[PDB]
């Protein structure tokens, strides 16, 4: 069918500290900062592969693991482990790079859901994907059953929204 | 069993206008910047609630219905709708409030399980909680399976952490 | 006369934490912040009672009554005061929410005067205002005295304008 | 009586561009933003005066004259225009230097009381004051009567007080 | 030859307090953040200078001499230290402004270099300029040196970019 | 001598777009956000190389060679390129990735000075550092004559910190 690119195409790597302004209660990283960075890289992944604009059409999920401390070097890893029709589903592994003892723990785990526009505003066709290493091997696996999952809670999700207009 | 909260003992808001900062593509709102300030309102209602310190434990979803634009006024309304053991749903709803027409759509929908915490930093016991009118009783009522569904995701979410811990 | 609103319609809530990035000296809100964060939604409940763009004309005055420390979460509850022509009294409470005792002490107040204006920038007219609750009615019994006081204020800084522009 | 210092002691300046960050309405800076800088340079100028920590008690006016655009280059200029036991008032000129024009038009107007403190966070006395040039003359001159409209003020804002402790 | 104009013309001052936001190392700034407020002023005070629109064209150095630590007051000076054709050597003096002390230690020294713009985008020829008081008349009588160790700094910068363009 | 590390063991990446708030002129990069941006990578390249807390000694030169606009994405590669005693030499590249055409423009290049630190606070040997790819033994071949230039600007400097102190 369609053109193909490498998850490792559009691969994307962001270093970033935890500044005392990243942190709500005494030295510990706020939650929804840690959201808004997993959102930006995310979305830079998205842009690479769609070679296009994107939005942010749904967070699938954010999985808070660890503690993230004022100090922390994080280390954002985004790519594209599914693309259907105009969407992405974006992963992005955030790990703690610990310099005194080189461990890489993850500290969290995220999956974003992007979609690709034109110049005017609409969704627009994007590549599809393919693996080469293991672990972009495992995402691709595992990609259609969360997009099944995903298919099911946006049914549910569309009852709400049509519970809260009446009222 | 135990003592128990009104959901609307909890019920918490928040009025926002999007300014630039706020913005990423021309004149509309950054997926990022809106997942911090419901993360913000969230950990608002979930400490009332539990009376005490919170973490954010997962995003369970953010679901981005509308186009946010630079000037808009943001609604955000944060509640407890399930009450696990330690654990706490937040759902919060963001409604732009267009001041020229009296209308209140709704831009996105949010939910979010939070873990109180007590001094020390472990995992503390919430009070339970009821609805009383019919909104809250519907996400008091849609609660239960959101939570089981939320289940099998860990489980997921657990077998991708320990592949990723092999490489 | 002309059309009126009731003091409830454009009555607005804020809830929101302090952050370290809020703060100035250690672990306690800087001025300046909670100056602006009383701005913002004062700047909305002007918005929504006039149905219009709105500008700060003028700080009436803030008086900081307690220290805020960082954690606390502040409740700010905006409501328009008074309605002169094409301005607005805009009264600011701002409470320290205790989520450990339930205390809600008032912790600063503020009045600010803002301007409605159409889409060529220029001063509009605005619907007239009328109290409902106890609270509601003591800002609205008090506004016209601080309304004159405004004026003599007006007086000698217009002095104070014309002095300094021969120098 | 006490030690006294020149009000050209303690007179601080500074110089800021407006950003777009610094915005709300299309290339209009926020009433907010203007407000936190004003806090700035002011509790700046009385930590010179005071040779003390600072903490701003009350904003007694901020008369907003002129819109301000971005890329503005906005002066703030703060002294101390009177000294009382432990408090300090502030007046702060804030004013666009165009350098296409060199005009200096007089943008803002404010005056902000502060009480310099100790190590241990009480009021701490601080030096008197005197003009030299026929500005801070004029500054000087004024500072009784707005004294003593601040003492109604807070005489008024007493009653306020009270009243919202019972509801 | 061409229109000159004092150093103490485009003199610019800037007083500012370091905050927690500013920080990243435990109550201590970051260089960064510094980087960013040096840069301002100075842009401030090369628009002064050139009555124009300005870009930085480089750093030629910033020189970190002490540890800012949280509270501190900073004190910018910058000044037009030489102008060529259409660019500026703008140098920035940054002292701590101890008030419990009376004492003003030089925290850091920097040098840039600005190209002024006319509306459509290209370099536009700036005053000449020349000093009055000693500090002034240092920069002034050092600058040329400066001026010419950048010209071969650019050379091997010139070689660095035509060699990573060929890989 | 002593233990050596790879210039590919500390190569750090960062990617990060452009938003409003990072602007200063319509649509364009303000320098100093830029600066910022490149001292926090470089930071994080010298933490990996030292294996320890940093600080920045110094900032060489900014060489901003083309404009960056708003929603542009930037890709910073900072990696060590010299390693004295106890200072790094930080070298910079900061890219356009443009993914519409895949064009990589060189937009700017930076060397830092770093100097690492124990945990009570004074500067701490650094492991010696070799290249492997070409770029890399660019950076490493063209090092020795880039830190004599720097001692010799760091005696002029000496001069004028000299200079200074008496005034
Ligand atoms: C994202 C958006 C453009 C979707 O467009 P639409 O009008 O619903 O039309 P479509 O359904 O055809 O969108 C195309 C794709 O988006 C997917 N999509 C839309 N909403 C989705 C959701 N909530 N979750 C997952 N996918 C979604 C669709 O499944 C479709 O995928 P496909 O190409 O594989 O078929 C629209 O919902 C929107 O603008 N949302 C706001 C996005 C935003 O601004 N986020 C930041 C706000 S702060
Ligand atoms: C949240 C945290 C304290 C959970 O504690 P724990 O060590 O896993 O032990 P527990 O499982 O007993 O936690 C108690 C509750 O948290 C829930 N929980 C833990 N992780 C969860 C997840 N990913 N999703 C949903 N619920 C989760 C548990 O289900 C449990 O709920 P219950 O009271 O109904 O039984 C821990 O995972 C953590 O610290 N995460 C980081 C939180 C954070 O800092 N977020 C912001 C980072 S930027
Ligand atoms: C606010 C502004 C539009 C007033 O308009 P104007 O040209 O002075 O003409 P008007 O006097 O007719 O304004 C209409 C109303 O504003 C009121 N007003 C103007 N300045 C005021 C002040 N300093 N304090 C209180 N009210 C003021 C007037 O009293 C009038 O009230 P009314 O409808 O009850 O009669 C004008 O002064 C302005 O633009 N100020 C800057 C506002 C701003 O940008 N603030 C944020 C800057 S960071
Ligand atoms: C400012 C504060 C220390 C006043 O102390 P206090 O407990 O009221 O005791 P005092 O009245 O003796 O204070 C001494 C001086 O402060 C003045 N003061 C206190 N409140 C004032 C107000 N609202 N307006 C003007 N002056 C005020 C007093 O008049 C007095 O002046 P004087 O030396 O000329 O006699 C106290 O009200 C406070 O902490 N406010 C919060 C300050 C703050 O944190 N602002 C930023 C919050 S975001
Ligand atoms: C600065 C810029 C306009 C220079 O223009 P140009 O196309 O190179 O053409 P010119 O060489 O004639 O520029 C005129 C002056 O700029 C100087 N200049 C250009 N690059 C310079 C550099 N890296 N260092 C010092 N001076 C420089 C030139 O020496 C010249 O000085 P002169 O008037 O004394 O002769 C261009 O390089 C540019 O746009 N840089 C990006 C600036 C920017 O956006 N910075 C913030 C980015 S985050
Ligand atoms: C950086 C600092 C620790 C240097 O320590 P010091 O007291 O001068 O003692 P030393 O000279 O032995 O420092 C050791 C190394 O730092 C280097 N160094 C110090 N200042 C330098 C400068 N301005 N430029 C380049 N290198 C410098 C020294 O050359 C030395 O390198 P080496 O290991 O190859 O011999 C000290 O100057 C400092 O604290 N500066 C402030 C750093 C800072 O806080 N920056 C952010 C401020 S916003």
């Not at 842009?47 to 939005?55: F, L, S």
């Not at 482990?81 to 790990?95: H, K, N």
């Amino acid at each position: 069918d369609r053109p193909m690119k490498s998850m490792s195409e559009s691969k994307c790597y962001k270093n970033r500290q935890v500044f005392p302004q990243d942190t709500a209660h005494h030295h510990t990283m706020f939650g929804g900062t840690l959201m808004a960075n997993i959102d930006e890289i995310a979305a830079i992944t998205a842009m690479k592969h769609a070679g296009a604009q994107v939005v942010t059409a749904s967070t699938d999920s954010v999985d808070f693991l660890k503690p993230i401390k004022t100090g922390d070097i994080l280390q954002y890893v985004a790519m594209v482990s599914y693309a259907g029709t105009s969407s992405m589903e974006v992963v992005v592994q955030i790990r703690i790079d610990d310099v005194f003892n080189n461990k890489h723990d993850l500290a969290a785990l995220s999956y974003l859901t992007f979609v690709a526009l034109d110049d005017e505003g609409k969704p627009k066709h994007v590549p599809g994907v393919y693996p080469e290493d293991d672990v972009e091997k495992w995402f691709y696996d595992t990609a259609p059953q969360r997009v099944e999952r995903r298919k099911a809670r946006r049914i549910e999700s569309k009852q709400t929204i049509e519970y809260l207009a009446q009222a």
